[PDB]
Each structure stands twice: as C-alpha cells, then as structure tokens.
Motif scaffolding. Structure first.
Motif, mmCIF file in Angstrom:
data_model
loop_
_atom_site.group_PDB
_atom_site.id
_atom_site.type_symbol
_atom_site.label_atom_id
_atom_site.label_comp_id
_atom_site.label_asym_id
_atom_site.label_seq_id
_atom_site.Cartn_x
_atom_site.Cartn_y
_atom_site.Cartn_z
ATOM 1 N N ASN A 108 0.975 -0.992 -0.013
ATOM 2 C CA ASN A 108 0.019 -0.035 -0.153
ATOM 3 C C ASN A 108 0.832 1.418 0.000
ATOM 4 O O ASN A 108 1.395 1.691 1.030
ATOM 5 N N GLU A 109 1.064 1.794 -1.197
ATOM 6 C CA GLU A 109 1.965 2.928 -1.275
ATOM 7 C C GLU A 109 1.277 4.131 -0.511
ATOM 8 O O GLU A 109 1.868 4.761 0.216
ATOM 9 N N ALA A 110 0.053 4.561 -0.639
ATOM 10 C CA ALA A 110 -0.576 5.712 0.087
ATOM 11 C C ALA A 110 -0.577 5.536 1.480
ATOM 12 O O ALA A 110 -0.129 6.549 2.129
ATOM 13 N N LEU A 111 -0.723 4.413 1.851
ATOM 14 C CA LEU A 111 -0.870 4.054 3.369
ATOM 15 C C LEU A 111 0.649 4.079 4.082
ATOM 16 O O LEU A 111 0.783 4.818 5.158
ATOM 17 N N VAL A 112 1.738 3.723 3.360
ATOM 18 C CA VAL A 112 3.081 3.701 3.953
ATOM 19 C C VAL A 112 3.357 5.350 3.990
ATOM 20 O O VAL A 112 3.931 5.589 5.000
ATOM 21 N N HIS A 113 3.086 5.841 2.741
ATOM 22 C CA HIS A 113 3.558 7.304 2.850
ATOM 23 C C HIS A 113 2.814 8.246 4.091
ATOM 24 O O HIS A 113 3.811 9.017 4.683
ATOM 25 N N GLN A 114 1.622 7.905 4.181
ATOM 26 C CA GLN A 114 1.017 8.663 5.132
ATOM 27 C C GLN A 114 1.488 8.498 6.709
ATOM 28 O O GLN A 114 1.861 9.575 7.535
ATOM 29 N N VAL A 115 1.933 7.305 7.048
ATOM 30 C CA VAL A 115 2.513 6.848 8.169
ATOM 31 C C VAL A 115 3.929 7.485 8.454
ATOM 32 O O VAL A 115 4.307 8.156 9.309
ATOM 33 N N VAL A 116 4.798 7.440 6.984
ATOM 34 C CA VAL A 116 6.082 7.940 7.247
ATOM 35 C C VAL A 116 5.817 9.547 7.421
ATOM 36 O O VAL A 116 6.580 9.962 8.329
ATOM 37 N N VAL A 117 5.053 10.178 6.733
ATOM 38 C CA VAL A 117 4.794 11.444 6.898
ATOM 39 C C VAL A 117 4.492 11.954 8.485
ATOM 40 O O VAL A 117 5.124 12.792 9.199
ATOM 41 N N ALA A 118 3.664 11.225 8.903
ATOM 42 C CA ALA A 118 3.332 11.197 10.196
ATOM 43 C C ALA A 118 4.194 10.986 11.225
ATOM 44 O O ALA A 118 4.265 11.811 12.249
ATOM 45 N N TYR A 119 4.910 10.060 11.009
ATOM 46 C CA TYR A 119 6.125 9.660 11.911
ATOM 47 C C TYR A 119 7.137 10.990 11.875
ATOM 48 O O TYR A 119 7.820 11.457 12.966
ATOM 49 N N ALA A 120 7.329 11.427 10.723
ATOM 50 C CA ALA A 120 8.442 12.548 10.610
ATOM 51 C C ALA A 120 7.815 13.791 11.402
ATOM 52 O O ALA A 120 8.476 14.475 12.088
ATOM 53 N N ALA A 121 6.395 13.997 11.199
ATOM 54 C CA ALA A 121 6.046 15.232 11.689
ATOM 55 C C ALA A 121 6.023 15.042 13.479
ATOM 56 O O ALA A 121 6.209 16.108 14.240
ATOM 57 N N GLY A 122 5.660 13.986 13.919
ATOM 58 C CA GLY A 122 5.810 13.651 15.238
ATOM 59 C C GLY A 122 7.126 13.883 15.940
ATOM 60 O O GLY A 122 7.447 14.202 17.008
ATOM 61 N N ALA A 123 8.055 13.782 14.850
ATOM 62 C CA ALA A 123 9.685 14.086 15.622
ATOM 63 C C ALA A 123 9.809 15.521 15.588
ATOM 64 O O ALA A 123 10.795 15.741 16.760
ATOM 65 N N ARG A 124 9.167 16.427 15.068
ATOM 66 C CA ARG A 124 9.397 17.955 15.440
ATOM 67 C C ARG A 124 9.006 18.023 16.628
ATOM 68 O O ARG A 124 8.498 17.368 17.601
ATOM 69 N N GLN A 125 9.460 19.306 17.342
ATOM 70 C CA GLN A 125 9.002 19.775 18.677
ATOM 71 C C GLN A 125 8.371 21.266 18.412
ATOM 72 O O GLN A 125 8.084 21.752 19.590
ATOM 73 N N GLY A 126 8.454 21.635 17.008
ATOM 74 C CA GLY A 126 7.570 23.163 16.997
ATOM 75 C C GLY A 126 8.163 24.207 17.943
ATOM 76 O O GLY A 126 7.408 25.002 18.598
ATOM 77 N N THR A 127 9.317 24.377 18.298
ATOM 78 C CA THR A 127 10.190 25.252 19.253
ATOM 79 C C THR A 127 10.288 26.530 18.763
ATOM 80 O O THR A 127 11.616 26.841 18.376
#
Lengths: 102, 154, 37
Positions: free
Chosen positions: B24-43
């Motif tokens: 599932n290309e679309a599903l994997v991409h969304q999870v990867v983007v979500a994981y990258a976003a969670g890595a931020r801290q928005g400081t």
RNA sequence: UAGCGGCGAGCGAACGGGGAGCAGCCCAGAGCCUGAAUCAGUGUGUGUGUUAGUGGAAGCGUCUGGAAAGGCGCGCGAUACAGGGUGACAGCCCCGUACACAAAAAUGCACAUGCUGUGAGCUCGAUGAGUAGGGCGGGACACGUGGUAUCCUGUCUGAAUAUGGGGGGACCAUCCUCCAAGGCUAAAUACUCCUGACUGACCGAUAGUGAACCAGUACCGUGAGGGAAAGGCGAAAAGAACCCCGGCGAGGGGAGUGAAAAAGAACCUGAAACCGUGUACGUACAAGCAGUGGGAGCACGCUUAGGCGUGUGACUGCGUACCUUUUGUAUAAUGGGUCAGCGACUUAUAUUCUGUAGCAAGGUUAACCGAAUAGGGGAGCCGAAGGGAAA
RNA sequence: GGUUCUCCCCGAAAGCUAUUUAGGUAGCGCCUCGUGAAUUC
C-alpha cells in the motif's frame, strides 16, 4: 597539563615549513607557541627617537598553533604523540609507540 | 510463507497475510509523513494515526522488504565481548554495511558494540519505526524477534 | 538646584508611599542618570 | 449535559465509571506500669551521593598547490563518530567522552552507642452546652422588605440528649450512622528573573528582544512615562624601512612583505538607482509621455564573391499613454520622485460538507501509565430496528 | 485607502419585482461547477 612546554624539541606538522625541527621559546595563553628559526616574518619596524633605533626590516618569529607542532621523539626520528602517567605520585609525560619517559 | 535462511537453512513459518499482503503505497507514505511530523517539537505537529492504519503500514513494509530480499532471518546474533571490532568483523564477513540489528531482547554487549557505528543500528522489536525500517538498507532479524513480531501484529 | 531637588529629587519620592512606585521603575531600567541634582 | 433568562446572544453542577504518580493522626486518660514501640532536633565515626580536579587507547609517508581536514593504495581504533574551535570539509595533530582513584570544610536519603524528649499495649468509662428555635432594630446574599429558602446575628433574654435536628438522588412513617467551643496533614499538579548539562523540518544585523561590542546608549523633557543608528578585522596584524612631490599635514603614486593588494585603519565578496572618461552611430527643417516593424548610410570581429544578427539608425505608415478611484478617466477632477531592504498569518478551539485509505456484519478510544509515537486500557462523542406520521 | 506574484477554461446586474417598517427582510427569468435527466423546449 600542557603537552608543549618551555623547553621542548618539536617538529612542524603543517604550514609552509612542515618538517623542520626547532625548540619552543614560549607558549601563549591563546594556544600558540613561538619556535625560533622557522616562522620568520619580515616586519617593517617604524623608526622611533627613543633609546632604541633599529628601524629597517626585522626578522621576528610569528607564533603558530600548538596543534601544528608535535614533540620530536629524538629516537625514532619522527613526530609522536605524548600522554601523561602518574609515577611515584608525580605526573610525567611519556611518548607512544614504545612509549618511554622524557 | 517460507523464509529461507543462509546459515542453517532452517524453515520458518510466518503468517501469509501479515507478510504477503500487497504494498500500500499511499498508506505507507501517510504513516512515514506522520512519523516525521511527530519528530518535530515546534520550538505541536503530531498527527493521529489509527492503530489499524499503523499496523497495516508495518505489514506492508515488512512484506515489501521480504520481496526485495532486504530482510534476512538468522539465528541468535550476539557478541561474546562488548567490542566494536567483533561486531564489525561479524558484519564484514557477512558483507553488511548498512544494517539494522533487530534482536528479540536487548543485549548490553551488542548495544555497546553498535553504539559507535553509525551505519549499524541495533534495536528491539518493540522499538521499531517505519522510517528506520525503510531508511536502513538491510534488516536482519532473529527467530525470537520474528516470532514476537508475528503475535503482536496478529 | 534650589527649587529643583526639593520637589523633583530622590528623597521627594521616598517620603510617601505614592512616590515609592515612581522610583521602582528606575531600578528595573537603570539609566545613566537616576535623578537630577 | 439535566436546569435557569423579554427561555435573545451568553454565563453554568453532581453520583457512578475508565486512570491510585494518596500514607489517613493527636487531645478530653484516672489507675496497675515510663527513660517502651513508632519518630524528630542537636554532635562524633563508618558506608553510599551532590558541589571544585587529574590520569585515559586510537593515521607514519607520497602526487598537485604557498599552505592540506578532502582524493588513490596499505592499517589501527570503535562501552568512545554529542556538538563546536585548531592555515580548505578533522574519530585517531589539540581541547571534550568508556574504564580506574582521592575527602581538611559543609549539606541531604536507610543503619551502632549517649543527654534532654509533647508519648504505648491490656483492663475499667465517655463520643464535643452561652447553642438551636422564638422576639425588637439594619446591611450584604440578582430580588425594590415579596408568594421567599439558605448564609452572617451587636445590645436586652433563654432548652433538651432517641420525648430534639440533618442526610439515604428532598410530603408525613421505620432501622443504623451522624447531632454545635479541639489541634495537624508530605510529594506530584501551579510558577521560569539567576546556574550547569542536553534538545530543534526557529532565526542569522530593516530578522530576533529597546539592546549580539561601552544598550536600559548619544540626545530630548521640570520630574515621571515613552524612545535610534552602528561588527560582515585577516589563516597569521606580515598594519609600508628608504626615496620623490607637497604645506615638517590630508590624499595619491613606487618599492618591500603576502597565495591574492581597484582587500591598505569606509580594510572577504561589492548589486540597482544617481553622477564621469575613451571609441562608434544619430540630431543644428523638426512634429509636442514614438515602442516594436519596414528602409538607407557608417563603424569594431561575417567571409577563399553569400546587404546573416545586435546597438545606433535621417525620412514614412499605423495608434486620442499607464494605474487607482467611476454612471465616463483621451479630460484645468484626483493620486505615487525612483531604486534597494521590509510589509497588513486563514492559525488555535466546536459543528457541518467533500476527497483519499484498513476488517468485511468488534468501525473509534482521549488523558494517564509504558523498555516515553507500537503493545495494554472502551467510562464518553459519531453508528449498527428498517418499513411505519407515531407506536 | 487597501483583499498583494504568475497562470488555463468558464463566468450573475442599470431606470427592477412584491411592497412594508429602512439605505433592508422573503425573493429574479438568462448564466457557472457537480449530480439526476424522459424527442421535454
């Protein structure tokens, strides 16, 4: 705990005069050392009417970074790192690569 | 399906559905983007990801790695002493440079050995993320690690 | 100096509780001149 | 949310449950028995920590270049490649990290001994009187003394202990508990002006903070309040000896030093706009915000005849400039001097609608907890009895 | 005064209607995107 000291036989590692040996004259607090006979700089000395009137061009010594020179082993004929070890409670310097006391 | 080994050639049994599903290309991409976003801290840029969607992505990535033979199953992978040389030698003979040592249980000797190496990373089954799995060129699992992956994926 | 420090000086504000809040802002913003003399 | 309001916009609870990162004491105690059990304060000694330090492995050389942190071939190291500085982009040439040690002073969390210590177990008793209610004179509780509950009660007075009161998601009744002046209760959770370590899909001198250096500045005002600009020093200052011109200067030209000198105290790189020099072309009979195109002449490099292209380009033809504001903008109706830098986010928090993707008749958990994004957890919000006005 | 850079296709109105209570409430044939769509016009 300084590797280079007042009286040390050192060899240049880098610069326009890499490989030439010399003896350190003094060490500056800014991590720089002055070794005579290698880093010659021609300074245009402005004349002064004071007791000293050298004028002309003087051949001074320019300081170099401490990391640019290493203690000469004087036995293997090559530069070698130096570390510290405690012997009879007195801290002393020692070479590497068949390390022996100074 | 059957997971071929390279040292013992011992058969392994793994659920077809959780290791043979389409990619599932679309599903994997969304999870990867979500994981990258969670890595931020928005400081916060963290994004919610459904448990089923997260699990579905891992199954897809695991299936893809098996298909592209980037995943290798081996027996216990340990080092007798905590020395990086031993780990480096044990990987050079295996011809692995960018590998993820996913082990069933965290071992201090292995952990210390791989800590200095940057191309070599060691993790537990619990500590796995899609980004790390895709990023690392090869992943080598243990029999116990695979077994625990089967059950918690379900 | 005469009619300047008796009404616009340092002691002119410390004599009451209302003037204490005036000199309080000079402590947070310490300028080169605290008061005239 | 159940309620309350010209039921206008708003404001605004509790029990149970899902999560225990809570630990429940003392006095009214006479008598047989005290330096008890559980603990605190004040000293010393031992062991374990915090606050200043040291030792600590690992790259030798060659080509190009003034100089090597990068390239080619051969190795060491790797519990240590977290980051930055060391002549160009550095694990191993330095400064910091594993491992191994020290206690003259002070402080904090379990444990030997000593002095002063509000003090237990067993037996024999008890479970909290100027109060509630009522009368006279005021105010604050949304409510002007209302149909009016509850909370506070000066001065003058005055009861009771299952024969009096409240509560059980509030008519009356029953059983149990409770029924007035005592004394205490840590941490987490709130908050970031100062220190050390660590972190980033934030920023890099009109940014960020008034302020990156001598910014709470120069300067202004009677005081207070309020309130600017300014480092792009070079790797190392090698920061011009001597000579010539001139005013015993400023400024400029040589030489010397350096890899580089139109980088020479306005000092790495130096744009647009404004203001000059040298060459070529057009204009002194030209058509008034005329640019492109067609055409002639001339110049620096087409080119072994090839008016091929650009800039300039007399003369001709076509066309009532441009933007904002308007029923029209060619207008005696109005607006901007130009360039460079900067500049007026569609976010957070409800509801509704659309698009995309996983089990196929278990679709979804938030906070907290967790080897800190997975696993574990369903007390809510959105749905699964249609047909039937409704039942 | 001002809804700012660029770009392809398509694109509602003048003096009006109901008619009160006024710089406004219900409401405009023709026209747009998506859906439904019978020789309906």
């Amino acid at each position: 705990a300084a590797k280079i000291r007042r009286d040390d036989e050192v060899i240049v590692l880098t610069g326009k005069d890499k490989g030439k040996r010399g003896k350190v004259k003094n060490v500056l607090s800014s991590g720089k050392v002055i070794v005579e006979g290698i880093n010659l700089v021609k300074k245009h000395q402005k004349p002064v009417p004071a007791l000293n009137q050298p004028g002309g061009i003087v051949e001074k010594e320019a300081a170099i970074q401490v990391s640019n020179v290493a203690i000469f082993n004087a036995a293997t004929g090559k530069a070698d790192r130096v570390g510290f070890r405690f012997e009879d409670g007195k801290k002393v310097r020692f070479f590497k690569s068949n390390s022996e006391t100074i | 399906m059957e997971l071929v080994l390279k040292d013992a050639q011992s058969a392994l049994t793994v659920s077809e559905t959780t290791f043979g599903r389409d990619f599932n290309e679309a599903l994997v991409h969304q999870v990867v983007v979500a994981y990258a976003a969670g890595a931020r801290q928005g400081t916060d840029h963290s994004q919610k990801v459904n448990k089923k969607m997260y699990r579905g992505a891992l199954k897809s990535i695991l299936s893809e790695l098996v298909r592209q033979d980037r995943l290798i199953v081996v027996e216990k992978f340990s080092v007798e002493a905590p020395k990086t040389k031993l780990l480096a030698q044990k990987l050079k003979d295996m011809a692995l440079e960018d590998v993820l040592i996913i082990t069933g249980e965290l071992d201090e000797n292995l952990f210390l050995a791989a800590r200095n190496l940057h191309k070599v990373d060691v993790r537990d089954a619990t500590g796995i993320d899609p980004v790390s799995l895709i990023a690392f060129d090869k992943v080598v699992m243990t029999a116990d690690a695979v077994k625990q992956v089967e059950e918690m994926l379900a | 100096v005469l009619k300047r420090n008796r009404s616009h000086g340092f002691r002119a504000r410390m004599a009451t509780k209302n003037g204490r809040q005036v000199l309080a802002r000079r402590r947070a913003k310490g300028r080169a001149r605290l008061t005239v003399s």
